Design a protein around this nucleic acid. Sequence first.
RNA 1: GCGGAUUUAGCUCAGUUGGGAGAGCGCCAGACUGAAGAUCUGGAGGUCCUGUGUUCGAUCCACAGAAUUCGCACCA
Length: 537
Amino acid sequence: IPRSPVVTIMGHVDHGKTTLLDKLRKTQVAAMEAGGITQHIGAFLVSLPSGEKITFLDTPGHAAFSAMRARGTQVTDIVILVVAADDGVMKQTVESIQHAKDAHVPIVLAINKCDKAEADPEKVKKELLAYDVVCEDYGGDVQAVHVSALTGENMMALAEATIALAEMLELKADPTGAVEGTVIESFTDKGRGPVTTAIIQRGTLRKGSILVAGKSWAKVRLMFDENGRAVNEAYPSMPVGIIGWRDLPSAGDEILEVESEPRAREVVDWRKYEQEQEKNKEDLKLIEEKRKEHQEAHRKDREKYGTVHWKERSYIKYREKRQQQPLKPKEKLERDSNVLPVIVKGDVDGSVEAILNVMDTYDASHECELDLVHFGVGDISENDVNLAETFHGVIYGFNVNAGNVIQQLAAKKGVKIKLHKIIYRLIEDLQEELSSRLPCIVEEHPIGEASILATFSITEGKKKVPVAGCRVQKGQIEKQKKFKLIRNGHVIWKGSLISLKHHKDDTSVVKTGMDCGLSLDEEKIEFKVGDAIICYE
RNA sequence: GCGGAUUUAGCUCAGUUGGGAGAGCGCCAGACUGAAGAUCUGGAGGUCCUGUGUUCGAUCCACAGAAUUCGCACCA
């Protein structure tokens, strides 16, 4: 049976999600005055195109944003961000938004216990209290659309707005081949295989499942299946016969430390469900791009072609070869460049997606382009310390932490991890490597301060232009840099430097404590008296 | 700057107390070289520092007036 776009009521426990399901069971069936229920053991489930009162899944824990994945991104195509009508913001309510919108999963914020604030309101009538946890509008983002928790009402108005959000995403169902499904909640135990409650979104399960864990990936043998029925049964027999659009307790003892992020499927067909299996491990991720600065030299070949009698005989040949293809007589050997690209590691799915959204944007080399070359949801690894050492980068961790082996590897590489930064976001660091003083190249900045000694507009054994002698004591008063010389703060003149004319000494660069005469620009428009010459790139 | 101070072929030098500018490298072939070409030779290049105290010879040193290397003034 084709699944309606499901919600789950994500958010903090008893922020109206837990209290929703417990009363939902009893209330909904009366409160609709209509049917269209597709109830399953998982929660209380009723289809989206019922003209009154609709709700879907419960995750009896808290979070369910990454738990409820499917083959487009989430299975909860519309997600409910559960805030309480009584009490605003709680932690998992805001994680649900980030993970969903950044992963392009439409969002309902259904501040639950809807009856209790804004007087049993509809979709667009709870807004004040609903916006307490952020709401936006339709699309992959969050519209405030409401479902209650202590009555079956307001849920009619869930249907209305929620479907228009749901439009963008939906991964349907079948009662055929192997199953697809995700975990609604899956309990975490090491050294035990605890049961996994799942929304089986598509396909048929008998009693076999496959899950990911905080241990390892494994393919469990279920002891039994137990499920509420939509109903259509592939097998009417004593428990088997799961279809898509079903919630299923998958009871299996080969289950590991399966998180609420994994999926619970089954594969016994791979001519359809392999292509659903792949896809339903994702809804955590996005993209980054950046580019790096390099070296090249067209001299290491053309210089070599020249005279010397062997090389001349070669030269007659080289010219002929060049005519055929320019790349043919080349004998260049230019090499090596480094900037500082970094490696990104993160652990919260909405967080990495957020970092990625900012990061992909930066790929423009103003004068440098610097961000991450690699990102992943994981832990710091051997690769990350290697990356830091090679480019002259550093390891950017969100809150991931570094294991024992990577730390040893880090020491050998002569680098050390930065993680748990505060703010934990890596985009600030990545944008510091980017631009900082890199696009400054005509901008003023003291980086070549010196004091003006004199000028030799007048004779000094040679009468010249307004050649200003200056004692360099910071950076370089050189003809490369520009200047703004300040009498004490009042600019005398500002321009570039294009002279080194003197009569005592002439030097390419006036550095350190050396005095050399250079007119600042060519001549000077006010000369003699002054103090600091800020040379600026 | 000033100078000490060369003064003086393009520059450099000599011609010089005061009787031609000695010749040359940057022009130049021979020469040379393995050939090439400068050599050597001698010529192209002779502003005579500038112009002059000075001049039968001032072409010189020297000065009319000014420039400069840097000790020195400057150098702080």
